[PDB]
Amino acid sequence: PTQYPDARLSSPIILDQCDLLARSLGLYSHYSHNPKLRNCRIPHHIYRLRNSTALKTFLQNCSILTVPFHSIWDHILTSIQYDAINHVDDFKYLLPSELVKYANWDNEFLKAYLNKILGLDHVFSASARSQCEDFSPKENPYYWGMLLLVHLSQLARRIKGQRGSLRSNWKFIGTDLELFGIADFVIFKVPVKTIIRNAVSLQASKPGLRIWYRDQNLTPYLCDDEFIVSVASYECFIMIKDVFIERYNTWEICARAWLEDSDGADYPPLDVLGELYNQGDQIIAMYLEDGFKLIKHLEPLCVSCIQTHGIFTPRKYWFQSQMIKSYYDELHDLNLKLQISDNKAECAQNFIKTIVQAKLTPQQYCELFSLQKHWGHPVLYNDVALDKVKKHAQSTKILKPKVMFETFCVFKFIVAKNHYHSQGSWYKTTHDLHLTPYLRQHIVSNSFPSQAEIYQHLWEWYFVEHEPLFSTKIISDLSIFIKDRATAVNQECWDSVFDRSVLGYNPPVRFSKRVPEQFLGQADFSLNQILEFAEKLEYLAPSYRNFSFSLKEKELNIGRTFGKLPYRVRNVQTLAEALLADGLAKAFPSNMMVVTEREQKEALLHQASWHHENAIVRGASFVTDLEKYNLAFRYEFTRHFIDYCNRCYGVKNLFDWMHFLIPLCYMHVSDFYSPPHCVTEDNRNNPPDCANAYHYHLGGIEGLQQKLWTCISCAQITLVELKTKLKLKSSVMGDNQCITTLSLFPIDAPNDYQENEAELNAARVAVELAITTGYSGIFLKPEETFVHSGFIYFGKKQYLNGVQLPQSLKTMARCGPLSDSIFDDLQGSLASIGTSFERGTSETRHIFPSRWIASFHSMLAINLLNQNHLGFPLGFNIDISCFKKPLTFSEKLIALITPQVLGGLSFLNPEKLFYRNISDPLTSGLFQLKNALEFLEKEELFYILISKKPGLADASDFVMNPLGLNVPGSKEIITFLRQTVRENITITSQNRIINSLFHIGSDLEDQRVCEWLLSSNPVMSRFAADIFSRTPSGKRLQVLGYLEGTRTLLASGTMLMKLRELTRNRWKSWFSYIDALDDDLSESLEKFTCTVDVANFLRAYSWSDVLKGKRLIGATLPCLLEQFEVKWINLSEDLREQFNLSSLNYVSCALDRKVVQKHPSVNRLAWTIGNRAPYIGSPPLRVNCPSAALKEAIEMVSRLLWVTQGTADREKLLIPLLNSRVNLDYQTVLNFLPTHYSGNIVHRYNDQYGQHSFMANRMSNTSTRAIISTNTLGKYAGQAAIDSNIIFQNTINLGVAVLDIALSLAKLSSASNVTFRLMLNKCCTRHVPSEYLYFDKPLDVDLNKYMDNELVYDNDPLCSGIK
Amino acid sequence: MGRTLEAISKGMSEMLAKYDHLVISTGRTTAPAAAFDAYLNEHGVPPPQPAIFKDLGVAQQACSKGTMVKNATTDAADKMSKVLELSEETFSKPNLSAKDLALLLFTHLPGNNTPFHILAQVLSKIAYKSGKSGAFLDAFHQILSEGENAQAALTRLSRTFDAFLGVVPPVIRVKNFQTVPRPCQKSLRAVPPNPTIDKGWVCVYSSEQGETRALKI
Amino acid sequence: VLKMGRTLEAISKGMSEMLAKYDHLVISTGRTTAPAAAFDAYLNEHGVPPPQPAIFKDLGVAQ
Amino acid sequence: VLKMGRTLEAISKGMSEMLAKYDHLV
Amino acid sequence: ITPVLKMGRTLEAISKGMSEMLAKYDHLVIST
Ligand SMILES: [Zn+2]
């Protein structure tokens, strides 16, 4: 009940078991390369499917032969696209016309809202072509197919979910392409004539079929039968559904953008999309799985076209040349492997030519880069996948001792230098001083040598030895073990992961496997006991010598593997990576880069100077791949780095686990239906090498020692920097590493000369790095490496000469009706849509095309779940069971308008176009609701919709949700299951840490602490939440959150009935507003006019039982869009025509006229950058290694001291809280508190300890041309400024966002300027007097019970340096 | 003797560090020279243990005495020598054959089997023979960056690029004039006295019966 | 003193020769390095060869 | 001149250890 | 004071170590 088949595709596509279905139906199929499957006995749960009568009539008049899945892929897509309109009666519900109607209404609403906010009428006009109801049905080629596959995919999820009944099936009959779904399989059925298509034979028409039938007269098997069949899995069908949804969203966004702008829109035109989509489909049909080798080239080709845009230098075309040459090489291989004539393979040439010959702008190429997964994914074979891994991990390397020696010495030097600049002194050396002369007179005088002289005396660092650093018995988090992970089984039972019938024998020993279920099963779990396990080399026992691979989900290569270890070896790996990430990986900056065109000139001159202004700095970068490093590491290279780490931590043998253990295992893939080719019963203990599996892996594996490998990479880059004497800055993404070389020029230098010389210097560095890594066994491949003066990857974004490029489609094309939540929750789906929308707007400049898609999918979720919910019987109609009559359009609309904080279903707040972090969601929600009801003309419903009956909530609910209301409808579904999860923990747990944390009387402690935190005379809920997060109750809640995402723990009939009743109750509360009313509350509310007064009254009334007559403070803050209004001071003459207009305290904003870079022209504001940076304007003791417990105790002491009065009795309130985390007495703690004694409690709490937004939710190019000045807002620029509602960090974000949104579509010039001001309004500003919280009673509960938990308690808080 | 003693102290310390690092790195199983040679001669492949060579060139030449056969050890050395050949003026520079160069030009042209496709084949072959393919590619790219299409670029390169001055068009053997591609039929002419590429004559079609047609672009 | 002059003249020649040779050395990796290290670490810690040591005999390390 | 003697003795110490390690190989 | 005499004695030991290492290099390193 809790878990269902996945809504979207997340698993590799494996088609081994299909071979077993075809053999039981009498058909022929050759998906697998494994010879075990040709003659094994069929597993019973598959062999029994041949008895279903529905499947036998579906297979009448079919041929004995079948075809693979992709050879049909082409015809499947075309047939569903053109035939889906004749089956509207199948999905008559889903009400398609109503989806379009709601989306159109939402765009009109948002246009009205933004016109009112920006202060200009008519900024946004009417292209009557996008606004008609018939636009999308008539002009989008994927509309009807997408709706049909949404319906069919829900049916398929239901059938797979049932455990196999032999009568549970679904089918779809079309003009072509009949479908049939049974337990795990889907069968596609197409007429033979549409595949032969006037050709000599079947192989003549589709040459890719020669792999299954080499050259055989197939006509005896195809004359008497009209149809042919392909067998596939449920994942193939889900992947098809995903492809239709992605293509529909992409086409709709592009079409609407091109009607909005029509001169330049940052999206590829529709001609290019139609061509690429058709040609990729044909390539896949013709070349089957391989086609992905050609299609995999779309991304590098887009990058190479972007790179050809700056000032001409021949090197700027080299990457593109390399890619084109690479593309045809692949083609030449494929054409000889399938014996394809040149005239047959025109689709491949058309694909490359369409990309190159389309002359798009850099923005359109950057968006087209995002269509990489719009053709589906390939079938994976574990033997093809492991041939590559085996070859790379067993090869022999040629290494040079001098290079290895020098990079090791640089490693030790980096560690020593970071220690000295951190603690102002040398660490305590224990080696003889005589051996190293240069370093001795720097040690005796306590000075550190300069960067310039380090290389000459580099060898002396080999002899340096010292005292241990980084004590081991403390790690910061200690909650990384609880988290979910996949593990392998122990070596006694390594066969148990395969099928008994495919194997051919019954394994003697049968095995649980999950990490959350095995962390709870381990009876002791010390942290010192893991250390002891590693130190004594206990793992080398025969029981722990198993390792198994598994393949990755959504990629286009032949298969990438991630590895799985036994449970206790996984603990050893986790502890080692955490120790390294806290202590020693801190000395290596792997993300030191920032984009150089956006950096200040003084900082560049200081950083790019070798030693220590009339100089010019120009940078150039190149990109290397870190993925290919893992298999190339050998022990001869890494012995020394590992040994030095062991010494630095005092431990011995801890960091050697991977190189000692991995070469002793048997490497294989744990696929349920593909055991190793050659394993038999007697052969089982020591099996031999075959195509699947092998012995003696000598390199690393993808994620086993990531921290150490990144540190070694940083050390070689520093060595190269010493050798070439050029300043370098390196940054690490998930996969790529970008290196920037900074070079200095005189003032009088031609621009062309600088461009050429900067690239030459970057190339010297690239050559030097290639040699340095080649002599370490790691080979950079110069063909996939480019050197450029403008192109960079910095965050997860791409920049060209400092101009950020859009990447909106990457996130907006995956928008859908359903997400992965519990029991198919409606809020889960709507919340997923809302978050994807807010990220999507941050990465583009067109607003309305994405907003239409988000609104469309929201209404679709409501309709689909109303009549096809998986948790109910097949046809159920939730609305009829609840309200005794179907819902109407107006009722669904009103639910989707009401904000979630008020108990509705609206997750697309327009204010999030300006900034993500909103100070107070209640006031902004009330502002939005009032505007929407004024647009809808139903202005009398405001006080009816906001005044709902309060529920029944305790004090703990109010502490967990400080800023919300007590309405039943705003509550999430997980809060109803948490109570069950906790119960299973007290039944199935043997872990001592968990049993001590969840002791017998923990519920009473939570209740008592929450009641006490709300017992101050003025109640402050933000303070209560901050404190509660750091007491042991907060830790208990965090651990609950980690363990929730599990099975048979959350799951454990009557559970189905509990969930069904909850769901019906939630639907009644969301979609009925006359049922929930307090006429008294509405009568009381109608008098107020400001939104702040309304929020205060609602919070007071909703929580009356908890508050007991006391008054609440520190929660209500004004909405910025209601506190400030935009007034336009000066607009140039060319913008007055476009905006269709004819002619004290404030913030002032203007547009900077000077432009630094631009791509392609100066005609749009988001195509250019400037000079400005408006965001930059806005402890006596300290321990070296503070644990998490000490950090949280310090925060609690700080907050509670700052809230109370000086003449109070502060110590007795602090002891009961502080005694539960650390062992310090009261007085010692104050020695670590920073400076205090300045602030105004109500106002200064929010800004001191609140969570703010540091920027506007727009692309970052506009901020570089904005001149914001907050000096003119009078007495608020600390007189009455520290004592007001205004937050002066948020007015800057608002000013940048208004400037960006207003000119998002305007056509700019060299003569255009803009200046306006944000004016303060009097209604919302309040004068909040300084007020203290008075606790009349200290906490009376024994919180001192956790001295045994190291997860909660710090027994010796200060054992590291006092510093 | 202070200087002649201090120099020896520093050099000895450095020598000590380097050779200590080496022995720890490959220790305790490395194959000495005599055992390495014996195993290689008797088996035909080097042992599965680490070994130390004097130079990279010595490693490239490690093969069985009786017959010269490449071995995993030799391959490792050849890969590394190709890396050492890199220079920083030609890092990631495209190396293109005459056939390869033609494919790139086709990718930039519109249509199919037009006169410009034949012109691209002819120009790429002539440029590669005279060793000026890299300069030819850079000139083409420059004209593209100025803002023109591939067709104007090819015409301008035929006129001005140095390798094509005073070069006679090649001769293509065909069965008849129906064999020439359909889009190129309209451009056929009669053979001029002294055809040359820089004046606009691409190639010469000679039929099976001695009839010659000249392609003009 | 003369014996010292001659010993120093021998030592300087030998040291310069060793450093010049070290500049050009190159090594190749093998598959017996990490297993040999693991075997030695286990004897140092416990005094006996590791359990199911047959694999180490196959690699030629257990000795 | 005392520093020279000490340095020489330190160098001799290291030579003995590093010679033992090489003695293991051959 | 013992150090000067010790230095005189040691140079002979250092010469012996250098001769032994020149000897070992000829057996370890492949030079065919
Ligand atoms: Zn107001």
XYZ file of N, CA, C and O in Angstrom, chain A residues 312 314-315 317-318 320-322 324-325 328 332 352-353 356-357 396 398 401-402 404-405 408 435 437 459 462-463 636 639-640 760 763-764 766-767 770-771 774-775 779 782 785 787, chain B residues 10 13-14 17-18 20-22 24-25 50 56 72-73 76-77 79-80 83-84 86-89 91-96 99-100 103 106-111 137-138 141-142 145:
352
model
N 38.154 36.462 -33.444
C 38.667 35.291 -34.158
C 40.117 34.976 -33.814
O 40.993 35.845 -33.871
N 42.414 31.126 -34.651
C 42.185 29.804 -35.248
C 41.837 28.748 -34.226
O 41.000 27.878 -34.487
N 42.445 28.816 -33.052
C 42.173 27.816 -32.039
C 40.697 27.748 -31.708
O 40.203 26.677 -31.336
N 38.232 27.337 -33.475
C 37.485 26.344 -34.261
C 37.980 24.896 -34.120
O 37.379 23.958 -34.669
N 39.057 24.709 -33.367
C 39.635 23.379 -33.199
C 38.747 22.355 -32.508
O 38.692 21.211 -32.934
N 35.504 22.231 -32.451
C 34.455 21.863 -33.385
C 35.014 20.928 -34.442
O 34.382 19.934 -34.787
N 36.217 21.215 -34.933
C 36.798 20.333 -35.934
C 37.001 18.933 -35.361
O 36.669 17.941 -36.003
N 37.491 18.849 -34.129
C 37.726 17.555 -33.501
C 36.438 16.760 -33.350
O 36.421 15.558 -33.577
N 33.601 17.020 -35.140
C 33.083 16.596 -36.435
C 33.820 15.366 -36.943
O 33.212 14.442 -37.473
N 35.140 15.368 -36.795
C 35.962 14.242 -37.221
C 35.615 12.996 -36.420
O 35.555 11.896 -36.956
N 32.200 11.296 -37.597
C 32.214 10.473 -38.796
C 32.971 9.182 -38.578
O 32.594 8.156 -39.152
N 31.710 5.562 -39.693
C 32.406 4.623 -40.564
C 32.464 3.224 -39.956
O 32.384 2.237 -40.688
N 23.947 15.518 -38.064
C 25.089 16.414 -37.814
C 24.932 17.736 -38.568
O 25.197 18.815 -38.015
N 24.447 17.689 -39.818
C 24.320 18.921 -40.585
C 23.278 19.869 -40.012
O 23.473 21.088 -40.032
N 25.008 21.752 -37.194
C 26.081 22.703 -37.498
C 25.549 23.870 -38.317
O 25.866 25.031 -38.036
N 24.725 23.594 -39.330
C 24.325 24.605 -40.297
C 23.277 25.568 -39.772
O 23.011 26.567 -40.438
N 48.861 -2.475 -17.532
C 50.122 -2.120 -16.892
C 50.501 -0.684 -17.229
O 50.297 -0.224 -18.355
N 53.445 2.614 -16.949
C 54.838 3.032 -16.891
C 54.872 4.344 -16.109
O 54.282 5.332 -16.556
N 59.667 7.728 -11.299
C 59.816 8.064 -9.885
C 59.972 9.539 -9.615
O 59.385 10.023 -8.647
N 60.630 10.306 -10.480
C 60.871 11.710 -10.145
C 59.572 12.490 -10.038
O 59.406 13.319 -9.136
N 56.547 11.273 -9.406
C 55.811 10.838 -8.218
C 56.408 11.418 -6.949
O 55.678 11.875 -6.055
N 57.730 11.415 -6.863
C 58.436 12.000 -5.733
C 58.073 13.460 -5.539
O 57.673 13.874 -4.440
N 54.513 14.014 -4.317
C 54.374 13.711 -2.886
C 54.924 14.818 -1.998
O 54.244 15.274 -1.064
N 69.105 16.870 8.588
C 68.785 16.384 7.253
C 68.239 17.479 6.335
O 68.566 17.504 5.152
N 68.382 21.365 5.835
C 68.972 22.679 6.134
C 68.137 23.939 5.851
O 68.117 24.837 6.688
N 62.817 18.898 -2.200
C 63.101 17.566 -1.672
C 63.098 17.467 -0.146
O 62.690 16.451 0.407
N 60.627 15.552 2.150
C 60.442 14.116 2.324
C 60.743 13.678 3.739
O 60.108 12.747 4.236
N 61.699 14.335 4.397
C 62.155 13.935 5.713
C 61.316 14.497 6.843
O 61.488 14.068 7.985
N 51.587 1.425 -6.450
C 52.937 1.994 -6.479
C 52.900 3.502 -6.416
O 53.857 4.130 -5.961
N 50.884 4.522 -2.394
C 51.374 4.044 -1.100
C 51.692 5.191 -0.169
O 51.323 5.180 1.008
N 52.459 6.157 -0.674
C 53.020 7.198 0.166
C 51.964 8.168 0.663
O 52.008 8.597 1.823
N 48.096 30.797 -25.550
C 49.362 30.064 -25.559
C 49.783 29.652 -24.157
O 50.229 28.515 -23.962
N 47.855 26.773 -22.903
C 48.347 25.562 -23.559
C 49.681 25.063 -22.990
O 49.903 23.843 -22.934
N 50.607 25.956 -22.585
C 51.836 25.451 -21.950
C 51.450 24.644 -20.727
O 51.966 23.548 -20.478
N 48.557 23.177 -20.078
C 47.871 21.920 -20.392
C 48.874 20.849 -20.787
O 48.731 19.690 -20.399
N 49.894 21.201 -21.575
C 50.910 20.215 -21.958
C 51.678 19.722 -20.731
O 51.916 18.515 -20.561
N 49.556 17.369 -18.812
C 49.435 16.079 -19.481
C 50.644 15.205 -19.183
O 50.496 14.014 -18.909
N 51.849 15.763 -19.240
C 53.022 14.953 -18.898
C 53.015 14.539 -17.424
O 53.250 13.369 -17.082
N 50.553 11.799 -17.023
C 50.876 10.588 -17.764
C 51.914 9.741 -17.059
O 51.777 8.521 -16.981
N 52.935 10.374 -16.496
C 53.873 9.687 -15.579
C 53.354 9.338 -14.267
O 54.095 8.998 -13.359
N 45.877 9.233 -18.069
C 46.066 9.789 -19.400
C 44.962 10.770 -19.765
O 43.816 10.367 -19.986
N 43.997 14.509 -25.364
C 43.933 15.895 -25.859
C 42.801 16.167 -26.857
O 42.522 17.337 -27.148
N 39.763 17.688 -25.020
C 40.136 18.839 -24.226
C 40.181 20.062 -25.130
O 40.626 19.980 -26.278
N 40.977 24.453 -25.290
C 41.513 25.614 -24.597
C 40.813 26.851 -25.148
O 40.863 27.109 -26.354
N 74.823 18.124 1.380
C 73.521 18.372 0.737
C 73.225 17.365 -0.373
O 72.105 16.826 -0.465
N 72.253 14.014 1.194
C 70.900 13.983 1.745
C 69.859 13.827 0.644
O 68.927 13.016 0.767
N 70.007 14.585 -0.448
C 69.048 14.504 -1.551
C 69.047 13.117 -2.188
O 67.980 12.526 -2.427
N 67.130 10.713 0.012
C 65.667 10.809 -0.047
C 65.119 10.145 -1.308
O 64.186 9.332 -1.250
N 65.712 10.451 -2.459
C 65.159 9.941 -3.710
C 65.249 8.431 -3.784
O 64.277 7.761 -4.165
N 65.527 6.244 -1.278
C 64.632 5.656 -0.285
C 63.177 5.624 -0.761
O 62.487 4.598 -0.631
N 62.700 6.719 -1.345
C 61.353 6.733 -1.911
C 61.185 5.650 -2.966
O 60.192 4.918 -2.954
N 62.165 5.497 -3.862
C 62.052 4.490 -4.921
C 61.908 3.079 -4.357
O 61.032 2.301 -4.783
N 60.962 2.031 -1.381
C 59.693 1.793 -0.687
C 58.543 1.644 -1.695
O 57.601 0.863 -1.489
N 58.598 2.394 -2.796
C 57.487 2.380 -3.758
C 57.340 1.034 -4.466
O 56.221 0.579 -4.703
N 56.625 -5.772 -10.528
C 57.212 -4.496 -10.955
C 58.664 -4.671 -11.350
O 59.331 -5.612 -10.924
N 63.189 5.338 -20.735
C 61.957 4.962 -21.430
C 62.253 4.176 -22.710
O 61.522 3.233 -23.052
N 52.503 -6.314 -23.382
C 51.842 -5.280 -22.597
C 52.817 -4.217 -22.094
O 52.480 -3.037 -22.071
N 54.009 -4.624 -21.676
C 55.002 -3.663 -21.204
C 55.436 -2.694 -22.303
O 55.615 -1.509 -22.049
N 52.739 0.007 -23.087
C 52.690 1.048 -22.074
C 53.728 2.123 -22.362
O 53.467 3.307 -22.181
N 54.909 1.705 -22.802
C 55.984 2.636 -23.125
C 55.686 3.458 -24.381
O 55.996 4.655 -24.441
N 52.668 4.320 -25.583
C 51.664 5.314 -25.194
C 52.325 6.525 -24.555
O 52.023 7.687 -24.887
N 53.238 6.268 -23.625
C 53.892 7.372 -22.942
C 54.791 8.192 -23.881
O 54.853 9.421 -23.763
N 52.720 10.629 -25.719
C 52.415 11.808 -24.882
C 53.584 12.785 -24.830
O 53.386 14.002 -24.851
N 54.812 12.279 -24.694
C 55.978 13.172 -24.627
C 56.199 13.969 -25.898
O 56.918 14.973 -25.867
N 54.165 15.785 -27.385
C 53.277 16.943 -27.450
C 54.084 18.217 -27.396
O 55.115 18.296 -26.728
N 53.591 19.226 -28.103
C 54.130 20.571 -28.041
C 52.957 21.494 -27.847
O 51.824 21.175 -28.206
N 53.244 22.658 -27.320
C 52.187 23.560 -26.905
C 51.634 24.444 -28.014
O 50.651 25.151 -27.785
N 52.263 24.471 -29.188
C 51.684 25.161 -30.339
C 50.680 24.280 -31.058
O 49.810 24.797 -31.762
N 48.838 21.640 -29.469
C 48.070 20.872 -28.503
C 46.617 20.822 -28.951
O 45.969 21.867 -29.077
N 46.111 19.620 -29.196
C 44.743 19.408 -29.647
C 44.467 19.986 -31.037
O 43.318 20.223 -31.397
N 45.503 20.182 -31.841
C 45.352 20.615 -33.229
C 44.801 19.483 -34.084
O 45.230 18.333 -33.938
N 43.797 19.777 -34.915
C 43.219 18.709 -35.730
C 44.146 18.248 -36.835
O 44.725 19.069 -37.539
N 44.276 16.938 -36.991
C 45.094 16.388 -38.052
C 44.097 15.764 -39.002
O 43.389 14.828 -38.637
N 44.045 16.266 -40.228
C 43.072 15.764 -41.183
C 43.640 15.287 -42.511
O 44.466 15.956 -43.125
N 40.611 12.783 -47.386
C 39.242 12.294 -47.299
C 38.515 12.921 -46.118
O 37.352 13.291 -46.216
N 39.213 13.014 -44.992
C 38.661 13.582 -43.766
C 38.321 15.063 -43.883
O 37.308 15.516 -43.365
N 35.051 15.669 -45.760
C 33.852 15.393 -44.977
C 33.436 16.611 -44.170
O 32.251 16.897 -44.047
N 31.804 19.181 -46.402
C 30.440 18.756 -46.741
C 29.477 19.076 -45.619
O 28.328 19.452 -45.866
N 29.902 18.873 -44.378
C 29.027 19.220 -43.261
C 28.633 20.689 -43.262
O 27.550 21.042 -42.785
N 29.492 21.570 -43.755
C 29.077 22.978 -43.761
C 28.264 23.425 -44.970
O 27.882 24.599 -45.019
N 27.999 22.546 -45.979
C 27.356 22.993 -47.232
C 25.911 22.546 -47.292
O 25.587 21.419 -46.904
N 25.058 23.339 -47.929
C 23.650 22.968 -48.077
C 23.371 22.206 -49.349
O 24.034 22.379 -50.371
N 22.326 21.401 -49.278
C 21.937 20.608 -50.412
C 22.695 19.299 -50.455
O 23.241 18.812 -49.458
N 42.525 25.042 -43.859
C 41.403 24.998 -42.924
C 41.267 26.302 -42.143
O 40.158 26.835 -42.011
N 42.382 26.879 -41.688
C 42.310 28.139 -40.944
C 41.772 29.282 -41.805
O 41.001 30.120 -41.316
N 37.948 28.844 -42.105
C 37.301 29.217 -40.856
C 37.264 30.726 -40.680
O 36.289 31.261 -40.171
N 38.329 31.417 -41.067
C 38.330 32.872 -40.936
C 37.240 33.513 -41.772
O 36.521 34.408 -41.299
N 33.988 33.060 -40.048
C 33.754 33.933 -38.901
C 33.416 35.356 -39.329
O 32.684 36.045 -38.624
